[PDB]
Structure 1
């Protein structure tokens, strides 16, 4: 499938190959087995130009895989600040919750990504959102001893 090759070029960081596949008309939202889209894979691996190429062709910025994970979740977890920023400008749901009720803010708090945390807050991240464990991102910064972050959040 074109969407099959699109998914692999996105994961492999092959900018030229993504553009060609999209110009050919690969399904910009093709799904792998767990419902990942090429945008999840580009966000997961930090391929900003691909994220960019994908949005341009209409990728659903808010796609969810079978776990309810969005590309923003992946960018925030893995610490790709510039992917966070591009996704947010294209309308990514700042307060999307995955299967554990984790917002992208919870994930950036868990991993201690300070610049991502500020960026998300700038775009309206709900500081008061509890996950399914009944934790806010502040609770998590309290639970991890990240005083720098706890200081951002309180």
Structure 2
């Protein structure tokens, strides 16, 4: 009944938290969706939200569900939402995902781990980062490292 998609396998919930429409996401989530639906690549509406964040969209989302730790659908290389958020450097969102749950041992195996993902993100963007950005990344970097312990 609820699951019918566009030609990428994208549910109606996906599109809202893709384009980051909060007044849409809200209204839709009301009646709206079985969660962890996987589009044709295997992502979930929380991936999209984390990936684009859309901080105040992912807050509405992580509320309901939960759905907060979702692995990869095959072919999408097994990327958790925190992995995704660390790939997109949305730290306020990465911080949000750490409350209400966390995968931090996830070691998502693109060959890498959550810290390694952030580290490779930093390495790649080393020049071009703000002061504030460099600092958000340091916090997060010491925080993840002290997670495994």
TM-score band, normalised by the shorter chain?
0.7 to 0.9
Q: Is the 8 A contact 2:119 2:141 kept in 1?
A: no
Tell me the residue number matched to 2:55.
48
After the TM superposition, which of the residue ranges 100-109 and 6-15 deviates more from structure 2? 100-109
Q: Is the 8 A contact 1:28 1:57 kept in 2?
A: no
Q: Is the 8 A contact 1:2 1:27 kept in 2?
A: yes
* RMSD of equivalent CA atoms: 2.1
Q: Tell me by how many angstroms 1:55 deviates.
A: 1.0
For these two proteins, the number of residue pairs brought into alignment is: 127
Q: For structure 1, which runs of at least 5 residues remain unmatched after alignment?
A: 128-154
TM-score, scaled to structure 2: 0.75
Q: Is the 8 A contact 2:62 2:68 kept in 1?
A: yes
Q: Give the 3 Å change call, closer, same or farther, for CA 54–89 of structure 1 in structure 2.
A: same
Aligned counterpart in structure 1 of residue 64 of structure 2, from 43, 57, 64? 57
Q: For structure 2, which runs of at least 5 residues remain unmatched after alignment?
A: 4-10, 123-132
Q: Tell me by how many angstroms 1:31 deviates.
A: 1.6
Q: Give the 3 Å change call, closer, same or farther, for CA 5–14 of structure 1 in structure 2.
A: same
Tell me the residue number matched to 1:39.
46
Q: Tell me by how many angstroms 1:85 deviates.
A: 0.3
